[model samples]
Target: GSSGSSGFPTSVPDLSTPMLPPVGVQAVALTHDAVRVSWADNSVPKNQKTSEVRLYTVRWRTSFSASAKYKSEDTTSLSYTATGLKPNTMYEFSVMVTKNRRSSTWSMTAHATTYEASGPSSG
Candidate 1:
C-alpha cells in the first residue's frame, strides 16, 4: 500500500514514485559523516504493517567517485549527512524503503559537498 487510502502514507507519494529507480542503496559514515537511504516500500496501511522508521536505510559515498555503503537507521525522512568530509569533498547518497521491494522510482539524484572545516566562505 505504498499509498493506499489507508489514512497513512508510505511517507510521501512524491517519494514513492521517484523519477528513477534506486537499488543496492547503501550508506557510509566517516568520523563525523553519516548518510541514510531507503526505497522499495510499496505497502499501504490497510495491506499490512509498514516500517517503524527503524527499518529504513540511508546511504552515502565519501568521495565523488566512490561506490556507496549503507547502514540501518529508522527515519521516514530521506536525508542523510556526509560527516567528517574533507572540507570540499563531495558525498553522494540515496534512499531505500524498509521493504525488500515495492518502491516507486528513485528520488531526484542528490549530493552534498561538505563545506570547508574552517567554515563556509570563511576568509
Candidate 2:
C-alpha cells in the first residue's frame, strides 16, 4: 500500500482561543455608601475579535460582609456601581469575562473604600 499525500483534507477542529481576563479593573467611591467598579475588555483589541460575545461578571464584598455580592452586566456597559454599603469601609472588587459558554478567570483585585460621612457636628 503506497501512502501518498493527494491533498487529503484533515478533520482538525479549530478550537477558539480562550479569552483573557478583563483589564484596568478599577473601583471608585461614588458616594458615602456607593462604589463604582469598572473594567475594559482588553481582549477585543488584542485579539481583534469584536464579534465575540462578552458578558461581565462583577463580584464585590465589603470587609464586614460574610459572602460576596455579584452582578451580571452585558458588554454594552462596562461600569456598575454597588450602593447601600457601609461608610468608611473597604470593599474588594473583581471582574471576569464570559464568552462562548466559557468564562475567563477573575481579574486583578481592585479595592475602594467608601467615603466617611461627617454627621452633624455637636459642640
Candidate 3:
C-alpha cells in the first residue's frame, strides 16, 4: 500500500450533554399550612458560567392517596415552599430540573407531614 499525504483527526467531536436529575432532596414542614422542599442543583458544572436560566418544578400530593393529582409549582430558586396544605397531613414531594429547552427526570421522593393545629378548643 502507498502512504497517503493527508491524515485524519484522531479526537472525536463532543456532543451535547443531557441534563442530570436533581438529588439530595429534602422536605420539611414550616407550619400547619406550609412545607418547604429543597434539592441539589447538579445539572450545571461548577467551573462553567451558566447563561440559560435554570428552573425547578416542585410536585407534591397527599401520601395517603395514590391516585391523587399532584400539585406543581415552578421557580428559579433551589428551594420552594408549598402552601395551603392541610394540617397534620402527610405529603410526598419531588423535584425536577429544567434548563434551556431540556428537562430532567424526577428526583427521589421526599416525605413530610404538616404541623398540627396549635389550639384544641376556642369555642
Reference-based lDDT, each prediction? 0.45, 0.73, 0.79
Clash count per candidate: 31, 0, 0
Comparison by lDDT, 1 against 2, better one: 2
C-alpha lDDT of residue 5 in model 3: 61
User: Candidate 3 at 105: error in angstroms?
Assistant: 0.4
Q: lDDT tens digits, residues 69-110, model 3?
A: 889888888799999988888888999877768876677789
User: What is the Å distance of residue 1 in model 2 from its true position?
Assistant: 68
User: Where is model 3 poorest over a 10-residue stretch in terms of lDDT?
Assistant: 9-18
Alpha-carbon RMSD, candidate 3 = 14.6
lDDT of 2 by residue, 25-56 (tens): 89988877778888887766755645666678
- Candidate 3 CA-lDDT value: 0.79
Clashes of 3: 0
TM-score of the candidate numbered 2?
0.68
Ranking by TM-score: 3, 2, 1
Per-residue lDDT, model 3, residue 11, is 28
Alpha-carbon TM-score of each model against the true structure: 0.42, 0.68, 0.74
Question: Per-residue CA lDDT of candidate 1, range 1-123, in tens?
Answer: 366555754434444342234444444333323333333433333367635323334545455454555433446553444444455566656664534444433333455454445545446
- Candidate that beats the other on lDDT, 1 or 3, i.e. the better one: 3
lDDT of 2: 0.73
